[PDB]
């Protein structure tokens, strides 16, 4: 039983637009902040790589569907490129080519028995909106509503699973470093919090829009995908446990407390630590923006499920470190990783499968067991088809998730592996491989070929259980 997926549980794979599509300026698509980063700052990216072509999924989407069908995916999670649909960011111009592309992909999926799950925003802000300041500028919340209206109107007759945002915890960091994630702006501890505030407002507007203009007719579900690492106390002390709770609240709670709790608002520890630090540093005003009571009420409850992106764990101990100002410093935890944990091709990603179970329990207890869809989980190597590390990563994480479901009563409702194929890995370019299908980026045809992990995942999806040879 503990090794069998619940009957209604949905299994599949995931991608993101800038990581796979290419066709960056084709057929009316406008420029986004990743076009800007990779074109103007190739020194920020391994090998000076760009997403100009990537997997060429703009042209090769039928090949993506073919491999999803081979895999036996029930659901395909992909994102829509805002600037492909609204090249100016604002909703004055709708690019028919973009509408046609996503309709073509959606229709191809449905014709092959695969359910689309659509992420509205996976990091590729139109440059015209970044030029207003991007996410720190609250005017983007209304622009995001207008973008979502276009998506619901055009695609919502066939798409019933939506994520507003993918991982704002990471993309807010684009406002916390001059050399980091797009748009690579150095306002740590100030502009990143403003970005979060706008994103939360935007999410809430999109959810209310769906309620008001679309839900009765379309009958779908709207969530948000949040990334979170497990944070294990470095020692069993109360003080180290406190630091791990700080981590959860500063990383997951930042977004989930306003939306998924009955109280709403930011977590108290976030408000209080930033208020105190801001006062101590001489600011008249806290660096953390505030919600009014009306806004707290508007934002809370804006969810039909919680998307979780889970990759790894950290150790947390009591203390403070980091630059002043920064969210890491504000969070009041000292973070490390255990040298004993298996490594990957990514410095940040260690293999800690039991952390996944711990995290799912933390979520269950904090948010009253919301339906959880695992929207990303995966592993990096530098290449190769005999990807035993990736196979072990998946089988262990799926086992731990299944224990969370069956032994712990966590309401996990689906899982999409990250990623369907090797793709443009942001600042890491093509140097880190997260796919279950390999892609030859030196071959203009970009063939997708299955790794051992794709074969094992196909076996899991077909049999609906963990094969015996991978059990404890």
Ligand X SMILES: OC[C@H]1O[C@@H](OCCN2CCN(CCCN3c4ccccc4C=Cc4ccccc43)CC2)[C@H](O)[C@@H](O)[C@@H]1O
203 near 142, Cβ under 8 Å? no
CA distance 204 to 300: 8
Chain centre distance of CA 423: 15
Q: For residue 18, state whether it binds ligand X (rule: CB under 6 A).
A: no
Q: Which is nearer to ligand ONB, 104 or 323 (CB)?
A: 323
Catalytic residue among 359, 376, 396, 400: 376
323 binds, among ligand ONB, Cl ion, ligand X, none (CB under 5 to 8 A by kind): ligand ONB
CB of residue 236 vs ligand ONB: minimum separation in angstroms? 24
What's the chain's length in residues?
A: 472
| CB of residue 286 to ligand X, shortest distance in Å | 25
Give the rounded distance of the alpha carbon of 278 from its chain centre.
30
Angle between helices 96-111 and 140-155 (to 10 degrees): 50
Residues between 89 and 108 with contacts to Na ion, criterion CB under 5 A: 94
3-class DSSP state of 68: helix
CA distance 257 to 253: 5
167 binds ligand X (CB under 6 A): yes
User: Considering CB under 5 A, how many residues would be counted as binding Na ion?
Assistant: 2
- Which range binds ligand ONB by CB under 6 A, 43-51, 184-192, 315-323, 421-429? 315-323
Q: What minimum distance in Å lies between the beta carbon of 378 and ligand X?
A: 7
Work out whether 328 is an interface residue with ligand ONB (CB under 6 A). yes
Nearest CA-CA partner of 360 in 395, 409, 404, 399: 404
Residues 103-132 that bind ligand ONB (CB under 6 A): none
Region from 245-253, 265-273, 319-327, 337-345 binding ligand ONB, contact rule CB under 6 A: 319-327
Q: Does 88 bind Na ion (CB under 5 A)?
A: no
> Cβ 232 to Cl ion, closest distance in Å?
11
Tell me which residue has tokens 């035993």. Answer: 388
The Cα 460–Cα 453 span in angstroms is 10
Out of 236, 262, 340, 442, the only residue in the binding site for Cl ion (CB under 5 A) is 236
Which C-beta is closer to ligand ONB: that of 285 or that of 321?
Answer: 321
> Does 323 participate in binding ligand ONB (rule CB under 6 A)?
yes
> Does the protein bind ligand X through residue 61 (CB under 6 A)?
no
Residue 24: CB minimum distance to Cl ion, A: 45
Residue 342 interacts with ligand ONB (CB under 6 A): yes or no:
no
d(CA 266, CA 276): 15
- Provide the 3-class DSSP secondary structure of residue 372: strand
Hey, CA dihedral for 220, 224, 230, 231, is it positive or negative?
negative
Q: Which stretch binds ligand ONB (CB under 6 A): 261-269, 307-315, 317-325, 447-455?
A: 317-325
468 is known as an active-site residue: no
- Which of residues 322 and 371 has its CB atom nearest to ligand ONB in the complex? 322
CB count within 10 Å of CB 292 equals 8
Three-class HEC string of 419-459: CCECCCCHHHCCCCECCCEEECCCCCCCCEEECHHHHHHHH
Is 469 one of the binding residues for Cl ion (CB under 5 A)? yes
Q: Which of 389, 416, 307 is nearest to 15 (CA)?
A: 416
Q: Does 348 bind ligand X (CB under 6 A)?
A: yes
# residues contacting ligand ONB (CB under 6 A): 4
**Sign of the torsion angle spanned by Cα atoms 313, 315, 318, 320:** negative
CA nearest neighbour of 331 among 319, 343, 342: 319
Q: Does 461 bind Na ion (CB under 5 A)?
A: no
Residues in region 3-62 near ligand ONB by CB under 6 A: none
Contact 119, 78 (CB under 8 A): yes
The verdict on 321 binding ligand ONB (CB under 6 A) reads yes
**Which residues, in sequence order, are CB contacts of 407 under 8 Å at separation 6+?**
2
Query: Which residue of 376, 381, 387, 400 would you call a contact of ligand X, by CB under 6 A?
Result: 376
Residue 170 engages ligand X in binding (rule: CB under 6 A): yes
Smaller CB distance to ligand X: residue 302 or 377? 377
Decide if residue 227 touches ligand X (CB under 6 A): yes
Taking the C-alpha atoms of residue 39 and residue 405, their distance in angstroms, rounded to an integer, is 45
**DSSP 8-state secondary structure symbol assigned to residue 31:** P
For residue 236, the partner it binds in ligand X, Na ion, Cl ion, none, with Cβ less than 5 to 8 A by kind, is Cl ion
Binding site for Cl ion (CB under 5 A): 235-236, 469
Binding site for ligand X (CB under 6 A): 16, 19, 166-167, 170, 227, 309, 311, 347-348, 376, 425, 434
So which residues are the catalytic ones? 376
């Amino acid at each position: 039983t503990v090794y069998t997926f619940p009957d209604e549980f949905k299994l599949g794979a995931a991608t993101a637009s800038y990581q796979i599509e290419g066709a960056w300026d084709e057929n009316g698509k406008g420029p986004n902040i990743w076009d800007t980063l990779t074109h103007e700052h190739p020194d920020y990216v391994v090998d000076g790589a760009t997403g100009d072509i990537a997997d060429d999924s703009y042209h090769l989407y039928k090949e993506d569907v073919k491999i999803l069908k081979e895999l036996g995916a029930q659901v395909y999670r992909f994102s829509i490129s805002w600037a492909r649909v609204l090249p100016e960011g604002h909703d004055n111009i709708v690019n028919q080519d973009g509408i046609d592309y996503y309709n073509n992909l959606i229709n191809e999926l449905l014709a092959n028995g695969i359910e689309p799950m659509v992420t509205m925003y996976h990091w590729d802000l139109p440059q015209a909106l970044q030029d207003l300041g991007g996410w720190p500028n609250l005017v983007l919340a209304k622009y995001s509503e207008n973008y979502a209206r276009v998506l619901f109107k055009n695609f919502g007759d066939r798409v019933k699973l939506w994520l507003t945002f993918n991982d704002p915890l990471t993309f807010m960091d684009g406002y916390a470093s001059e050399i980091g994630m797009a748009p690579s702006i150095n306002t740590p501890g100030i502009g990143d919090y403003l970005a979060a505030h706008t994103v939360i407002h935007a999410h809430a507007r999109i959810y209310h829009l769906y309620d008001q203009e679309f839900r009765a007719e379309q009958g779908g579900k709207v969530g948000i995908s949040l990334n979170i690492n497990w944070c294990e106390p470095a020692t069993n002390s109360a003080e180290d446990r406190a630091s791990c709770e700080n981590y959860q609240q500063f990383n997951l709670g930042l977004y989930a407390h306003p939306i998924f709790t009955e109280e709403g608002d930011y977590p108290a520890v976030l408000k209080d630590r930033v208020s105190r630090n801001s006062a101590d540093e001489g600011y008249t005003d806290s660096r953390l923006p505030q919600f009014t009571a009306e806004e707290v009420e508007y934002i809370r409850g804006t969810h039909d499920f919680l998307g979780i992106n889970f990759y790894t764990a950290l150790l947390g101990k009591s203390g403070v470190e980091g630059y002043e100002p920064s969210r890491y410093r504000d969070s009041g935890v000292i973070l490390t990783q255990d040298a004993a944990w298996p490594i990957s091709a990514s410095s940040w990603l260690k293999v800690v499968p039991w952390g996944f179970r711990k995290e799912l329990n933390w979520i269950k207890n904090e948010y009253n067991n919301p339906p959880v869809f695992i929207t990303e989980n995966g592993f990096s190597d530098y290449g190769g088809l005999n990807d035993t590390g990736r196979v072990h990563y998946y089988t262990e994480h799926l086992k731990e998730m299944l224990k969370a479901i069956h032994e712990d009563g966590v309401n996990v409702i689906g899982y999409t592996a990250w990623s369907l194929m090797d793709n443009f890995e942001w600042l890491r370019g093509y140097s880190e491989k997260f796919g279950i299908y390999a892609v030859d980026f030196e071959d203009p045809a970009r063939p997708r070929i299955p790794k051992e992990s794709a074969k094992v995942l196909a076996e899991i999806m077909n049999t609906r259980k963990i094969p015996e040879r991978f059990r404890d």
